[PDB]
Design a protein around this ligand. Structure first.
Ligand SMILES: [N+]
Length: 107
């Protein structure tokens, strides 16, 4: 499953619902602490609709427990990320990923 640890609190009341577009900034890291992706480096926030399975299971379940403005660290197990196959060249098999995600707003 996913484990959420608050880094900085959000409003404590606006949680994302199915069908909404979440606008976030993130940084992906492998268990070692090595970065592999980051909307921050691209200086452009990422958007995805909750429920449309366009991101890994772990983001859909973890981000749904965050509120607007909150910045959290998600620790996601293989079964909720890229599985046994991973994504060769980028993500190793059976990899536990750590994301530093900040929920900027909802649309
Ligand atoms: N995968």
């Amino acid at each position: 499953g996913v484990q959420v640890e608050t880094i900085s609190p959000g409003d404590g009341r606006t949680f994302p619902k199915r069908g909404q577009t979440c606008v976030v900034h993130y940084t992906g890291m492998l268990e070692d602490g090595k970065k592999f992706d980051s909307s921050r480096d691209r200086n452009k926030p990422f958007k995805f609709m909750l429920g449309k399975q366009e991101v890994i299971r772990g983001w859909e379940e973890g981000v749904a427990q965050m509120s607007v403005g909150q910045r959290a660290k998600l620790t996601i197990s293989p079964d909720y990320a890229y599985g046994a196959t991973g994504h060769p060249g980028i993500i190793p098999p059976h990899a536990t990923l750590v994301f530093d995600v900040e929920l900027l707003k909802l649309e």
